[PDB]
């Protein structure tokens with residue numbers, strides 16, 4: 001991005017040059033956090049209402065407080081001849097940079113609110129231009145500066161990557177790779193928050209469209225796939241034209257009515273299994289591509305028909321992915337009973353002790369002992385009722 005680019009401006013040169021670059025951009029970034037606080041946050045408190053400040057700036061002050069201490073510890077480690085303790089700074093501050101979670105989640109809606117407050121008031125609109133002049137001579141608006149903290153967290157792993165490449169001492173190279181991994185994890189934490197928020201928006205849209213559904217879709221996990229299909233059942237053997245929404249825990253069978261969809265059948269995937277039918281084959285005919293969805297006690301069996309082989313293939317992989325998410329490998333290992341969970345507060349995995357990243361269905365919780373864990377960590381968790 002152009003705004004970040006403009007704001008941030010021998011074999012062992014490269015190694016030493018990278019250290020200067022890291023320290024320079026960190027000072028430049030901490031001053032930018034200071035600029036938002038002094039030139040925008042304190043003067044706008046006299047204009048905007050307290051709730052508007054809370055929404056637009058979020059925890060910006062706490063970010064500045066964390067980076068003030070980070071730049072101080074960075075300077076001491078880089079200062080000492082050798083800079084061998086630099087890796088320890090990045091490892092310690094990865095856990096301190098958790099404060100970014102709240103920021104990353106709320107920043108898009110803070111930008112939207114800032115636009116609304118400025119559009120409604122020429123008074124605020126003129127004060128926003130005034131602040132930009134006193135801080136950066138109008139080169140950067142508050143709108144662009146509030147997006148800078150997010151651009152910055154995604155740069156740390158690109159900075160340490162270059163430093164690792166140009167480090168020749170095998171022990172310092174190995175220690176810096178631990179700091180590089182920890183920074184690569186921080187960049188993944190951002191993606192999980194953006195990705196989960198987009199899922200939460202998609203769910204909201206589906207609630208609007210689906211009629212006669214008297215339940216929140218958030219209870220069924222993540223949307224998998226949605227689309228037209230033909231359906232058959234044991235008691236009604238003729239193909240019914242339908243629209244289906246597949247989420248991790250449920251399949252909704254609806255009837256399309258322009259934009260609106262009327263719920264006809266609710267299928268709870270905890271009790272159902274997928275069975276392939278290769279009979280409709282070699283893409284012979286439209287609507288001949290079928291698989292079965294059978295209830296685990298033989299109570300019901302649905303035949304699902306799709307227009308093409310490509311479509312049927314895609315739906316089958318998504319049903320497999322959904323049932324694997326309800327019932328993952330080692331879900332009942334060591335006395336536990338791990339089930340899909342959406343965590344409100346910041347939580348760590350009982351097995352690897354790492355964060356359950358994101359804002360929606362981040363992992364699993366055993367209902368018995370209440371231990372939290374990642375999908376791939378279930379078998380490693382301590383036995384239920386230690």
Ligand SMILES: Cc1ccc(-c2cnc3c(N[C@H](CO)Cc4cccnc4)nccn23)cc1
Nearest residue numbers: 098100101102189190343345346347356357358
């Ligand atoms: C740079 C960066 C660092 C960390 C994050 C980040 C990613 N996921 C979380 C998290 N998740 C919890 C569930 O454990 C729910 C939750 C989510 C968001 C806010 N508050 C609570 N807690 C703290 C931070 N988190 C994102 C970006």
Ligand SMILES: [Zn+2]
Nearest residue numbers: 349352374377
């Ligand atoms: Zn884990």
Ligand SMILES: [Zn+2]
Nearest residue numbers: 336366369384
């Ligand atoms: Zn348990």
